[PDB]
Design a protein around this ligand. Structure first.
Ligand SMILES: O=C(O)CCC(=O)C(=O)O
Ligand SMILES: [Fe+3]
Length: 305
C-alpha cells in the first residue's frame, strides 16, 4: 500500500548546520522530487492554536454570503467561492501583514473580533516560518543558497479555509476537483477528517490519514526548479459521512518567478520563461505547460540520448 513519506519537521530538527537539519533536508528534497508532497510532523503550532484556527474558519465561513463577498471577487486567491451543496471557502490574504489582517477582521466583524485577528495572525506567522525553513532546505539541496534571500523578499502568505458539507453517505464522495496549486509551497491541516488525495507520477492515488500535516509543492516552485521538483495533482474525496474543514497556508512570490540559469542545462532545457503570479492566478480562473510561459522545450525524461 502506497503512503506519502513521513518527515519530522519538529522545531528540534530545524536548526541549520546540524545533522538532523541535513537529514531532513535530504528527505524533503527526495519527497518533493518524487511525490511532490509528504506527510509532516509540525510542532510550530500548538494543538490548542490549531483547534482554535479551525474554529475561526468555521466562524468565518458561517458569515452571511454578502458579508463574505466583502473580501472581493478574486477566488483564485482569497475571495469567497462555493460549489452548491458541496464545498465553500475563502482566504485571509497577506496573513503575515498585521495591518492587512486587522483590515480583514474589521471588514468581516465591524463590531470587533479580537480573538479572530490574533488567532489567525499567530497561525500564519508560525506557518510562514516553517515555509521559510522548507524553502531554505530546498535551495540548499540545489546549491542555490545565493538566490535564496532575493527569492524570499516580500513573500506573500495566504491563510485559506475550505469546508465540505456532510455527503450523506459512506464510500467515496468527490468533494473538490483535481488541480495543481499555484503556490510555492502549501501546508495543509485536515483538522482530523481525511480527504486530500494525491496522484502519483505513475497514476496511482494516495489518500493520507489525518494523522499529520501535509506539505505539497506548487507550480511556482516546480517552475523555479525547471521541473526538477514535482507539483502534484490532487483533489478531495471524502471517505466517510462527516463534514470536513481544511486549513491551508500558501506562499506566493512577490511578483515574478524565474528559473535560475544554473538549473538549466543540455539535459534540462528551460521549460518556463519568467511569469507573474497574479496574471497566472487570474488566468486559471477564466498543467503550467498550458500557460503562455511554457517554452515548448522537452522535459528531462524526454532528452534525446
Ligand atoms: O481541502 C483541501 O484539503 C484541499 C484544498 C486545496 O487543495 C486547495 O485549496 O488548493
Ligand atoms: Fe490544492
Amino acid at each position: 500500500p502506497l503512503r506519502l513519506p513521513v518527515i519530522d519537521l519538529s522545531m528540534k530538527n530545524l536548526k541549520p548546520g546540524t545533522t538532523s537539519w541535513n537529514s531532513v533536508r535530504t528527505q524533503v528534497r527526495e519527497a518533493l522530487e518524487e511525490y511532490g508532497c509528504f506527510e509532516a510532523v509540525i510542532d510550530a503550532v500548538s494543538p490548542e492554536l490549531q483547534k482554535a484556527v479551525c474554529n475561526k474558519g468555521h466562524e468565518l465561513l458561517n458569515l452571511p454570503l454578502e458579508t463574505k463577498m466583502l473580501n472581493g471577487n478574486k477566488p483564485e486567491y482569497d475571495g469567497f467561492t462555493s460549489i452548491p451543496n458541496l464545498n465553500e471557502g475563502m482566504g485571509v490574504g497577506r496573513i503575515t501583514d498585521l495591518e492587512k489582517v486587522e483590515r480583514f477582521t474589521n471588514l468581516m466583524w465591524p463590531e470587533g473580533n479580537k480573538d479572530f485577528c490574533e488567532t489567525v495572525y499567530s497561525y500564519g506567522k508560525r506557518m510562514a516560518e516553517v515555509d521559510h525553513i522548507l524553502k531554505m532546505m530546498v535551495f540548499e539541496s540545489f546549491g542555490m543558497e545565493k538566490h535564496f534571500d532575493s527569492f524570499c523578499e516580500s513573500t506573500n502568505y495566504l491563510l485559506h479555509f475550505m469546508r465540505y458539507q456532510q455527503p450523506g453517505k459512506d464510500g467515496r464522495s468527490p468533494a473538490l476537483s483535481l488541480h495543481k496549486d499555484k503556490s510555492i509551497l502549501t501546508i495543509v491541516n485536515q483538522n482530523d477528517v481525511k480527504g486530500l488525495e494525491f496522484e502519483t507520477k505513475d497514476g496511482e492515488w494516495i489518500l493520507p490519514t489525518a494523522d499529520n500535516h501535509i506539505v505539497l509543492l506548487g507550480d511556482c516552485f516546480m517552475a523555479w526548479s525547471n521541473g526538477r521538483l514535482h507539483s502534484p495533482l490532487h483533489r478531495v474525496t471524502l471517505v466517510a459521512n462527516q463534514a470536513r474543514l481544511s486549513t491551508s497556508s500558501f506562499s506566493f512570490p512577490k511578483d515574478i518567478i524565474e528559473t535560475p540559469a544554473e538549473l538549466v542545462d543540455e539535459e534540462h532545457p528551460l521549460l518556463f520563461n519568467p511569469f507573474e503570479i497574479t496574471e497566472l492566478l487570474a488566468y486559471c480562473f477564466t498543467d503550467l505547460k498550458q500557460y503562455k510561459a511554457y517554452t515548448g522545450a522537452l522535459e528531462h525524461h524526454h532528452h534525446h540520448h
